[PDB]
């Protein structure tokens, strides 16, 4: 486990495009916002792009090295009881339409938020965010 | 933020366009660091650091676009350099100069005899 540390860096904006001529340099596009790590009287500054951040769909990612090893929990074909807390109308042919308050059996809690559920004789995908444990 | 964190690194396999402000856009091949995993199917990530050396002159403060020296400081060229632009100065190793402005972008204003102009600071040394 690591320890997070925030280093307050001065920020600047690129006024023109810059193309790398050597490996330790960084390309710039007009308007890029960068953080300054170290300044050199040579006129060269060691910088890093101000990183973008935010919520993204897990399903759009794969592990760096073990991309074939699935990280999902195992299915539970016996099923676990949940109830729909918000109605949802299936869009895709493999999705399940539920009304608010309907009870279902969760059989696969996929990491991507689209869980496999069972409702009587029907099986399909349903948003985990619209389900709550009974 | 949190006391401790194990940061996991993943790779984007498809392009993603943000539909709300709290999301992040992705381009295939992007390398991201995962901060928090939600059972909702959303993971909070930051793009892996991209860094390197860049020219100070290509930068400006986030806010805004922004004296004569008659007695220059003695320096000597340590490496030959031939002027590229018309306002640059050509020097051979060993040639002494007067440094007028020690500008931070690596191109100092110098003077030698009846010539003045810009010269790489990295090729000058105090004399």
């Amino acid at each position: 486990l690591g320890s997070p540390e925030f280093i307050i860096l001065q920020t600047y904006r690129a006024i023109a495009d810059y193309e790398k001529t050597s490996g330790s340099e960084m390309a710039l596009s007009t308007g890029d916002v960068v953080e300054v790590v170290e300044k050199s009287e040579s006129g060269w500054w060691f910088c890093q792009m101000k990183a973008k951040r935010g919520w993204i769909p897990a399903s759009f990612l794969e592990p760096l090295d073990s991309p074939d090893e699935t990280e999902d929990p195992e299915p539970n074909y016996a099923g676990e009881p949940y109830v729909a807390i918000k109605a949802y109308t299936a869009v895709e042919g493999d999705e399940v339409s539920l009304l608010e308050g309907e009870a279902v059996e969760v059989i696969h809690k996929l990491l991507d938020g689209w869980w496999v559920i069972r409702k009587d004789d029907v099986t399909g995908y349903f948003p985990s965010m619209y389900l709550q444990k009974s | 933020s949190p006391e401790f964190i194990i940061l996991q690194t993943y790779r984007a396999i498809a392009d993603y366009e943000k539909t709300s402000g709290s999301e992040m856009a992705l381009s295939t091949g992007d390398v991201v660091e995962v901060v928090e995993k939600s059972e909702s199917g959303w993971w909070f990530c930051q793009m892996k650091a991209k860094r390197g050396w860049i020219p100070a002159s290509f930068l400006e403060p986030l806010d805004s676009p922004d004296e004569p020296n008659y007695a220059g400081e003695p320096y000597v060229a340590i490496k030959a350099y031939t002027a590229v632009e018309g306002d640059e100065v050509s020097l051979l190793e060993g040639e002494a100069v007067e440094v007028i402005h020690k500008l931070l972008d690596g191109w100092w204003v110098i003077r030698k005899d009846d010539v003045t102009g810009y010269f790489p600071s990295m090729y000058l040394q105090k004399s």
């Binding site: 919520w55 769909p57 897990a58 399903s59 759009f60 895709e92 991507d112 938020g113 689209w114 995908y125 948003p127 985990s128 965010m129 619209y130 | 396999i13 498809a14 993603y16 539909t19 709300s20 709290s22 999301e23 939600s38 909702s40 199917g41 959303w42 909070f44």
Partner: peptide, 11 residues
């Protein structure tokens, strides 16, 4: 808190 809509289906 994550977005208030489910993520897209996998690509």
């Amino acid at each position: 808190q994550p977005p208030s809509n489910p993520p897209p289906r996998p690509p």
